């Protein structure tokens, strides 16, 4: 975990008893988490009447610093020992170290669910269905008398343009082959649990 000089200076100003009292520190810190996690883009999130005495250039700078550190700590799975080390480096006092950890712990699960929802993935198979038919005749060939299976996979992903069902046919030998491959795959998951 690395943090730019811009973020470190924002935290150095949150560490001041002069610039921020313990009340304003708590209110700005809560506004930081709220602006990350709330679906409402609350433009008035910083308009708390107890924050109104702080210089609005400094206030909005320390708010973005806090939010940026929260996202970096979250991504890197920071433990309380890591958080407490970096805060004491920024000259935080024991009361504000406790306050930051309390707010971070309360929000940790929501933050990690958010960070993990970002990405793209392959089309995910979700179900299968099958038909069994006995083949009787073609306009060119009588007495075919062989079974065929008609298989459909249901896929459920939208990360790239796709069609939701894949349909193909199997003979008895082709379906027996296919099932053997999927059971070979399933036997490898079982082995991996022995790790």
């Amino acid at each position: 975990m690395e943090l730019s000089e811009s973020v470190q200076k924002g935290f150095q100003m949150l560490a001041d008893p002069r610039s921020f009292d313990s009340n304003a520190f708590t209110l700005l810190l809560r506004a930081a988490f709220q602006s990350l996690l709330d679906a409402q883009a609350d433009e008035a999130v910083l308009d708390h009447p107890d924050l109104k005495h702080i210089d609005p250039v400094v206030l909005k700078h320390c708010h973005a610093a806090a939010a940026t550190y929260i996202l970096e700590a979250g991504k890197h799975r920071a433990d309380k020992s890591t958080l407490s080390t970096y805060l004491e480096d920024c000259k935080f006092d024991r009361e504000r170290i406790e306050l930051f950890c309390t707010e971070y712990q309360n929000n940790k699960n929501s933050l990690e669910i958010l960070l993990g929802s970002i990405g793209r993935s392959l089309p995910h198979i979700t179900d299968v269905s099958w038909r069994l038919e006995y083949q009787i005749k073609t306009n060119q060939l009588h007495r075919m008398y062989r079974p065929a299976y008609l298989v459909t996979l249901s896929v459920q992903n939208t990360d790239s343009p796709s069609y939701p069902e894949i349909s193909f046919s199997c003979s008895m030998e082709q379906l027996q082959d296919l099932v053997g491959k999927l059971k070979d795959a399933s036997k490898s998951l079982e082995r991996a649990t022995q790790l």
């Binding site: 993935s121 392959l122 089309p123 995910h124 198979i125 979700t126 179900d127 299968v128 269905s129 099958w130 069994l132 079974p147 299976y149 298989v151 996979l153 896929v155 992903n157 894949i166 008895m172 379906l175 027996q176 296919l178 099932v179 999927l182 059971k183 795959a185 399933s186 998951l189």
Partner: peptide
């Protein structure tokens, strides 16, 4: 190119084993 989770793969084998059982 496709994807499954573990529990879905156990469902896929179960269903297509029942297919083969019909004959």
């Amino acid at each position: 190119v496709l994807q499954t989770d573990p529990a879905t793969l156990l469902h896929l084998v179960q269903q297509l084993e029942q297919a083969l059982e019909e004959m």
